[PDB]
């Protein structure tokens, strides 16, 4: 096996992904980003890089909302993220279109608080 057998949207996804280093995150079928509470990128997997074109190694440390993903700097994406950061229970799923310096690509996004401190998952798959 060369993949992690975890489905997008699984109810306990934050528990299953707590064990995963960067290599294991690259075994997921869906894009996975981990952000801090300000939106800085802590982790970013291969599937996400294939969806978006960004280089998973280069995006670490950039700010998702200010730097790499201005199309998500909106109430419908960033607004939802920061509300869930504030409440401590982020868990929201919605479709969205990624269109900054790329062919517009419609995705399903699932944001969910991670078990580690100051850490929040953004999961992405195509629709
Ligand atoms: C809109 O600006 C979306 C940009 C975007 C979406 C998803 C990822 O992973 C990146 Br780095 C940028």
From Swiss-Prot:
Against SUPFAM superfamilies, the record matches this protein to:
PYP-like sensor domain (PAS domain)
Q: Which CDD domains match?
A: PAS (cd00130)
Output the PROSITE patterns linked to this UniProt entry.
PAS
What does the similarity note say? Belongs to the photoactive yellow protein family.
How does the record describe its quaternary structure? Monomer.
Q: Which NCBIfam families match?
A: photo_yellow
Q: Which GO terms describe its molecular function?
A: identical protein binding; photoreceptor activity
**Residues where S-(4-hydroxycinnamyl)cysteine is found:** 71
The name this protein carries in UniProt is Photoactive yellow protein
Q: Which residues form the PAS domain?
A: 25-88
BP terms from Gene Ontology: phototransduction; regulation of DNA-templated transcription
What InterPro entries does this protein's entry cite?
A: PAS, PAS-like_dom_sf, PAS_fold, PYP
Task performed by this protein: Photoactive blue light protein. Probably functions as a photoreceptor for a negative phototaxis response.
Q: Which species is the source of this protein?
A: Halorhodospira halophila
Modification(s) after translation: The 4-hydroxycinnamic acid (p-coumaric acid) chromophore is covalently bound via a thioester linkage.
Alphabetically ordered keywords of this record: Chromophore, Photoreceptor protein, Receptor, Sensory transduction
- Nucleotide-binding is among the record's keywords: no
Chloroplast listed as a keyword: no
């Amino acid at each position: 096996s060369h993949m992690e057998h975890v489905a997008f949207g699984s109810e306990d996804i934050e528990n299953t992904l707590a064990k995963m280093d960067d290599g294991q995150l690259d075994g997921l079928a869906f894009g996975a980003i981990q952000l801090d509470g300000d939106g800085n990128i802590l982790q970013y997997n291969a599937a996400e890089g294939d969806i978006t074109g960004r280089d998973p190694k280069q995006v670490i440390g950039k700010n998702f909302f200010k730097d790499v993903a201005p199309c998500t700097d909106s109430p419908e994406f960033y607004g939802k993220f920061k509300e869930g950061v504030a409440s401590g229970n982020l868990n929201t799923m919605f479709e969205y279109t990624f269109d900054y310096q790329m062919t517009p690509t419609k995705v399903k996004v699932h944001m969910k608080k991670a078990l580690s401190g100051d850490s929040y998952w953004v999961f992405v798959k195509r629709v």
